[PDB]
Amino acid sequence: HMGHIQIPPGLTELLQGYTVEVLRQQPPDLVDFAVEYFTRLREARR
Amino acid sequence: HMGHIQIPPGLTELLQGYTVEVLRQQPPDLVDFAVEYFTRLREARR
């Protein structure tokens, strides 16, 4: 097994969720917001 | 034109920048990487 690419699934949905709330809640800062969202995602899953 | 607000630009570049390093650094945790990357961003621009 050598000479191939591996794209892990899950980045298409995780990004779609952020693109949603951002264009819906319209936060004052996307940077700081991106930290509050993903950081909270840790508790969401599992 | 008509309406009021539309898809704001600037989010496409911020995402492409992440999708890049994420595929290169291939970290074992994208959630922890997104929180460590964005959080460090605010400290970069200063």
């Binding site: 990004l15 693109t19 | 898809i7 496409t12 999708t19 595929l23």
Partner: peptide, 22 residues
């Protein structure tokens, strides 16, 4: 719409990166 702009949004991001970073 909005879901249509984000959908292809991820497609253009993947291409402009692995294509020799072009």
């Amino acid at each position: 719409l909005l879901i249509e702009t984000a959908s292809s949004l991820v497609k253009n991001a993947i291409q402009l990166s692995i294509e020799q970073l072009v």
